[PDB]
C-alpha cells in the first residue's frame, strides 16, 4: 500500500496548495433520503435550474464519461444519488474543473452543489457546479464484504461492514426497534425503568463467573455485575411494585456463537406475580414482538449459513412445557435418586454422565451434574419455544420452593432451538431458607465452582424487611435478536463483539 | 435484636402449626389505586355486603381499638386504604380472630378479603373477613426517615415519598431525551464497556481480566472512540445512554459509575450542537417545571434557595480570554510551551490554586479555568474554544489559533456537557495521541494510550461530525433539586 502513503502525500499537497483541507462545516440542503423522496418521481430529463442545493455522502463510484463529464454515485443514510458534473456548469471560483475533480477518489466523503433532476436515462441526479473534498479515504475499499481479507474483518473493522453491507445495517435497526417494542410493553403496564449498579461489592444473581476490579480511593475490590437481580428485588421491598432494567451484564467465561463477555439483558420484577403469570406474559410479549416484525408466528431460521437449510420456528401459544427432572428420567429410562443433592444421587449422576458420554462438570456438585443432564436430554428437545420448568432447588438458590413438588422450585427457562432465552421464577422471599441456600452457594464456590456466588448479607437484610410475593424474569436481548433477525452468530447482532488476539 | 429473633420464632411456630407460611400467590381483586378510584366518593358509612374483594399492601398502622375491633392502614402503589377488622365478620376457618390478628405487625406485607365501603368518619375502607400474612417484616420500622437511606435504599423508598419522586422524574427525563433524538432520526446503539484500550476522556480507568482470553481489559471511561467508528460506518446519527466507569474520587458530584448520554451527528459542528443543547435542555426544564426558571438548594434543603435561569440564549465564555480577564494578564504563547507552563505555575502560586500533577499545560489550563471561569457559571453557560493541548480529539478552531471547536456546559459551577466538532484529520490525531502517550509515560494517569484501531478507522474517512456528551445524573440533580449525586442514584457507592 503505496495507496495510503500516496494519499497522505496528496493531502499534504492540497494543504500546502491553499486548497480546501478538511472543511469544518458543510451545510446540506437535505438528506439523500429526503432528496430521493422529493425528486425521485420527476420526469426523465427533468432539471430545475432555479433551485440550487447542496448534498453529501460517501463516493461509491466515479466514472469520467468524457473530457467534459464525470458521473459519481454518492451514498448516505441508505440512499444512492448520482452526481453529473459537466465542465460547462463548473464554478471556477472553486478551482479549475479538472483540478477540483482530480482530488476525489472512490471512498471519499464529499459535498456537491447543483441543480436537481433526472438524467435522460432516468437516474435521480444532482447536476453539479462544485465539489468539495470533506474527508478522504486513505485505503482502497472493496465493493462488497466478499472482497475483504477475512470475514473476521466485518467484526474487527465494523465500520467496513456497515459501509458495504446493507444486511448488517438492518440488524442494528431491528435491534433498536425490538428494544423500543419491549420498553413500550412494560411502560404501558405501569412499570418504572431503573438503573442498578454495574460495580458490585458482592456479585450475585446468576450462575456466572465475574470480572474483578478495584476502586483505588474506596480501597475496595469490586465485581462487574453478572446480573441486576439482588438490587432489583430490593426495589420491590421498597414498594416500587413493577420495575425493569435493560443493560449490560458481564460474565467472565467462554466466547462462542451464543456467548459474548458483555451482553444485554432485560430483567423485570412484578409484585404479586408467580411463575405461571410470568409464563403467560412471556408468551404474550414474545409472540407480540414476533408478530410485529414478521407478520405471523411462524418464522424462518437458517441454523447454518444463509447458504444452509431454512427451518421454521413456530411461536404459536401456548408453548410446550418440559418438567426438568421428569424429562431427564425419561431420557435415562430410570429415576434419579432422592434427595437430589444426596451423595447417592451425585454418584448416580456421575455414573449416568459416563454411561451417556456427557462431559463431567467441575466440581461435581449435584446442581452442575443436573445441568449437564438437562443439557443433554432436555434442552435438545427444545426446537420451538419451550419452557423447561420446575428446576431443582439445589440449582436454583433464589427461586421459591415449588408449592406442590418436593425439592423443586417455581422456575422456568425458555429455550428456542436449544438456546436459553429467558430465566424466571417465583422469587424466594423467606429469609431463613435464603440464607441457607447462599451458604450452600458459598460452599460450592470454596470448593472451586467459579459460577457460585458469595453470601450477600445486604440482600438477606433486605429480605428481612419483607419482600412481597413477587415474580421476576430475565431475557437475553442479543439472543432474541439472533432469532428475530435470523442470525446464527451473536457477533452479527453486537456492534463490536469480543474477538481473539 | 430481640424483635428480630422473636419474629423468626413466631414464623417457625406458624410453620409448625400448619398456618399460612409465605403463601406463593395472593390474587388481588384490583390495585389500591383502582380501589380508591372505584369507591372513594361513595356515601359515608356505605358498605356493599354483596361484593367480596381481596386487597394487599404493606401495613403502615395497627390500632387495636378494642378486643373486638382492629384498624389497619395498608399502603401499595402510592395509595393508602384502611382495613376495619371486626370480630363479627371474621371467617373462623382461617383461625380464631385473635390468633389471626396476633400474627400481624406494622411493616408486614399482608392480604385482606372483605367488603368495600367507607367508615362513618368518611375513610375509604375495606371491611374485612380475613387476613393473610404474606411476608413479615422482622425489624421495627422508624415512623419516618442520610447514611441508612443510601445503604438501605428500600427503607428510604418504603418511608419517603420524596425519594420515590426523584426516581420517577429520572425515568421521565430520560424518556424525554430519548424521544427528542428518536424524532430526529437517531439510532440508539450499544458499544463495549470492556475495552482493550481505554479512551475518549481524561480519566483513570478500572482494570480487569478476561480469564479465557488471558487478557487484561479496561472498563470504558467513555464510548466516544467506538461511536465515531459508527459514523465512519455510515450510521449518520447515533446515540448511546449507559454507564461510564472512572476510578477517581467520590463526592457530591462523583460516583465511580455514572450514566452518560453521547451522540454523534454527521455534518454538525459545535455551533449546531450549542443550539441543540439549548433546545433540548430548556425544553426538558419547561416540561418538568412549567418555567425556565427553577429552584435549587446548593447546600441541601436546610440551606438557601437560589434560582437557575435556563432562558436562551445562554451565556458563552471563551476559555482563554476569561482566564486572562481573571488574571489581569495574558498567558504566554504558545500555550503548551515550557514558558507558558512555567508562567501558569506562577499564576497558580499567586492566586492560591492547587497545582496539578504532573504540571502539564493541559492540567494547568484546567486548574485556571476551574478557578476563574467555572465559578462564573451559575445559570447554564457554555465555556467555549478550549486549547488544543487539553482537547486531543477536538478539531482545530477554524479561526482561532491553538484553540478547538469545543464547548463544555456548566450549571452552578458543575460540568454537565462536553462536546466538539470532531477531529477527522488522521495525521494530527495521531500526533495528539502520541502527546497523550508521552503524558502518560511522564505520570499523567488521566492520559490514554494510543488506539491504533481508531486511527485506522479515521483513515477510512470520518465525515465532518459533531459529538456530545451529557452527564445524566448531574442533570437529574438540577431538575430534581438535589445537591448530592447519591440522591439521584438508587444504590450509590458507599465507603466500607
Ligand atoms: O442471553 C444469554 N443468556 C440467556 C439469559 O441467561 C441471560 C440473562 C437473563 F436474561 F437474565 C436470563 C436469560 C447470554 C448471552 C451471552 O452472550 C452470554 C455470555 C456469557 F459469558 C454467559 C452467558 C451468556 O448468556
Ligand atoms: O456527569 C459527570 N460529568 C459530566 C461529563 O463529563 C460526563 C461525561 C460526558 F457526558 F460525556 C460529558 C459531561 C460525572 C459524573 C460522575 O459521577 C463522575 C465520576 C467520576 F469518577 C468522574 C467523572 C464524573 O463525571
Ligand atoms: N438473574 C437471572 C434472571 C432473573 C431470574 C428471576 N429472578 C439470570 O441472570 O439468569
Ligand atoms: N467523551 C467525552 C464526551 C464527548 C465529547 C465529544 N466527542 C467525555 O467523556 O467527556
Automatic annotation (TrEMBL), chain B:
Occurrences of domain Aminoacyl-transfer RNA synthetases class-II family profile (ranges): 167-492
Origin: domain of life: Eukaryota
Gene3D superfamilies from the UniProt entry: Bira Bifunctional Protein, Domain 2, Nucleic acid-binding proteins
Catalytic activity entry: tRNA(Lys) + L-lysine + ATP = L-lysyl-tRNA(Lys) + AMP + diphosphate
Pfam families cross-referenced by the UniProt entry: tRNA-synt_2 (PF00152), tRNA_anti-codon (PF01336)
GO MF terms held by the record: ATP binding; lysine-tRNA ligase activity; tRNA binding
Gene Ontology biological process terms from the UniProt entry: lysyl-tRNA aminoacylation
Main location: cytoplasm
Locations listed in the record: Cytoplasm
Enzyme Commission identifier(s): 6.1.1.6
Residues annotated as binding adenosine: 244, 248, 255, 258, 415-416
Enzyme class, first EC level, given as a word: ligase
GO CC, alphabetical: cytosol
Entry keyword set: Aminoacyl-tRNA synthetase, ATP-binding, Cytoplasm, Ligase, Membrane, Nucleotide-binding, Protein biosynthesis, Transmembrane, Transmembrane helix
Keyword Glycosyltransferase among UniProt keywords: no
Record carries keyword Transcription: no
Annotated family: Belongs to the class-II aminoacyl-tRNA synthetase family.
NCBIfam families in UniProt: lysS_bact (TIGR00499), PRK00484.1 (NF001756)
Record protein name field: Lysine--tRNA ligase
Lineage: Eukaryota, Sar, Alveolata, Apicomplexa, Conoidasida
Amino acid at each position: 500500500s503505496h495507496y495510503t502513503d500516496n494519499r497522505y502525500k496528496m493531502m499534504e499537497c492540497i494543504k500546502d496548495a491553499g486548497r480546501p483541507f478538511y472543511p469544518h462545516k458543510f451545510k446540506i440542503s437535505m438528506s439523500l433520503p429526503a432528496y430521493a423522496l422529493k425528486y425521485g418521481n420527476v420526469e426523465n430529463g427533468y432539471i430545475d435550474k432555479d433551485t440550487t442545493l447542496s448534498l453529501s455522502g460517501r463516493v461509491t463510484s466515479i466514472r469520467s464519461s468524457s473530457s467534459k463529464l464525470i458521473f459519481y454515485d454518492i451514498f448516505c443514510e441508505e440512499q444512492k444519488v448520482q452526481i453529473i458534473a459537466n465542465i460547462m456548469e463548473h464554478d471556477i471560483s472553486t478551482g479549475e474543473f479538472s483540478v477540483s475533480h482530480s482530488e476525489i477518489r472512490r471512498g471519499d466523503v464529499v459535498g456537491f452543489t447543483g441543480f436537481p433532476g433526472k438524467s435522460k436515462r432516468g437516474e435521480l441526479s444532482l447536476f453539479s457546479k462544485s465539489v468539495v473534498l470533506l474527508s478522504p479515504c486513505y485505503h482502497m475499499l472493496p465493493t462488497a464484504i466478499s472482497g475483504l481479507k477475512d470475514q473476521e474483518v466485518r467484526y474487527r473493522q465494523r465500520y467496513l461492514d456497515l459501509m458495504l453491507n446493507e444486511e448488517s445495517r438492518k440488524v442494528f435497526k431491528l435491534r433498536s426497534r425490538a428494544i423500543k417494542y419491549i420498553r413500550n410493553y412494560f411502560d404501558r403496564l405501569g412499570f418504572l425503568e431503573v438503573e442498578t449498579p454495574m460495580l458490585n461489592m458482592i456479585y450475585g444473581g446468576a450462575a456466572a463467573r465475574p470480572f474483578i476490579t478495584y476502586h483505588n480511593e474506596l480501597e475496595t475490590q469490586l465485581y462487574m455485575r453478572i446480573a441486576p437481580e439482588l438490587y432489583l428485588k430490593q426495589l420491590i421491598v421498597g414498594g416500587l411494585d413493577k420495575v425493569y432494567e435493560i443493560g449490560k451484564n458481564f460474565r467472565n467465561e467462554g466466547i462462542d456463537l451464543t456467548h459474548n463477555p458483555e451482553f444485554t439483558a432485560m430483567e423485570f420484577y412484578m409484585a404479586y406475580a408467580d411463575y405461571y403469570d410470568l409464563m403467560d406474559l412471556t408468551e404474550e410479549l414474545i409472540s407480540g414482538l414476533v408478530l410485529e416484525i414478521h407478520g405471523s408466528l411462524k418464522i424462518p431460521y437458517h441454523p447454518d449459513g444463509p447458504e444452509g437449510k431454512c427451518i421454521e420456528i413456530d411461536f404459536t401459544t401456548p408453548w410446550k412445557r418440559f418438567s426438568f427432572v421428569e424429562e431427564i428420567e425419561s431420557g435415562l429410562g430410570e429415576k434419579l435418586k432422592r434427595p437430589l443433592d444426596s451423595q447417592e444421587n451425585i454418584d448416580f449422576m456421575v455414573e449416568m454422565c459416563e454411561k451417556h458420554e456427557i462431559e463431567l462438570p467441575h466440581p461435581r456438585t449435584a446442581a452442575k451434574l443436573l445441568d449437564k443432564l438437562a443439557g443433554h436430554f432436555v434442552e435438545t428437545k427444545c426446537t420451538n419455544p419451550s419452557f423447561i420448568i420446575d428446576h431443582p432447588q439445589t440449582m436454583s438458590p433464589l427461586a421459591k420452593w415449588h408449592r406442590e413438588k418436593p425439592e423443586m422450585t417455581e422456575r422456568f427457562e425458555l429455550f428456542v432451538l436449544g438456546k436459553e432465552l429467558c430465566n424466571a421464577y417465583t422469587e424466594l422471599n423467606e429469609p431463613l431458607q435464603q440464607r441457607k441456600f447462599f451458604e450452600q452457594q458459598a460452599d460450592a464456590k470454596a470448593s472451586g465452582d467459579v459460577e457460585a456466588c458469595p453470601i450477600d448479607e445486604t440482600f438477606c437484610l433486605a429480605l428481612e424487611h419483607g419482600l412481597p410475593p413477587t415474580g421476576g424474569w430475565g431475557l437475553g436481548i442479543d439472543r432474541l435478536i439472533m432469532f428475530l433477525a435470523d442470525k446464527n452468530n451473536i457477533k452479527e447482532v453486537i456492534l463490536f463483539p469480543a474477538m481473539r488476539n
